[PDB]
């Protein structure tokens, strides 16, 4: 039976202690962008460099 879960303790050890991992996996060239960063939006400027 394949599962066979972990075993931890408060003082189990630094390696034995659980590093909560969040795998933020990004794809930057997958589709039109839907989520962006927190930047203030300025006024739109036309006909200028």
């Amino acid at each position, epitope marked *: *039976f*394949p*599962l*066979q879960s972990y*075993g931890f303790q408060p003082t189990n050890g630094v390696g034995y202690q659980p590093y909560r991992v969040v795998v933020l996996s990004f794809e930057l060239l997958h589709a039109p962008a839907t989520v962006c960063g927190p930047k203030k939006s300025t006024n739109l400027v036309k006909n200028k460099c």
Partner: antibody
Amino acid sequence: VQLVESGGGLIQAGGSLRLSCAASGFGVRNNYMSWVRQAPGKGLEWVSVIYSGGTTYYADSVKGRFTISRDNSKNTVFLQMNSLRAEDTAVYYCAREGDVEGFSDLWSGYSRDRYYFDYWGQGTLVTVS
Amino acid sequence: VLTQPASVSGSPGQSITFSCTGTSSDVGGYNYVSWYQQYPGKAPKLLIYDVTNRPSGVSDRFSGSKSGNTASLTISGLQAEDEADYYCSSFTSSNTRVFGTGTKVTVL
């Protein structure tokens, strides 16, 4: 590794019990969780074993009575005792089978078969009276 | 049920060979036999998983073996604390494990 046991007590014939075995340092999932009875001054006649998941393996002489389950939330293996008979009178051990990398033995890689026994608890006396 | 020799008494230092019988279903064919040691009241401790292999914390003089339907223990150099019954656990014989009766050793 520590194993604490409870549930045994003096009951009349045809009663019910609930054997509780809580494991600290390992779970009921890590290694095979066996049930053994050691009759006073006799051998240890194997009763049952709950593996890491989903087993109904029993001995030839105790078929169809013992029911084995776990509450994984509290890490407890339960042996619910119904329809006692004479031969079940013994001291009962919840046995931790030798987990993966048994005593860091330098030959066995992840073969969890390893049908031997690791350290156990203090044992519970289960008496039919 | 594997059969083992009964209670015996002896001298420290030399070798005692305890052979225990079995069936061809478990010992003769399969090779997952293990042996244990217990002190009355305390739970059994592992002596020889796989018989040939020896866990740590155990004196190296303990040695066991299997021959056909029989399993042999070649124990060497007895001492005072060694007086305890020796239990033979073979393979689970198509998922129903079996043991021997027990060999209670005595010393002077």
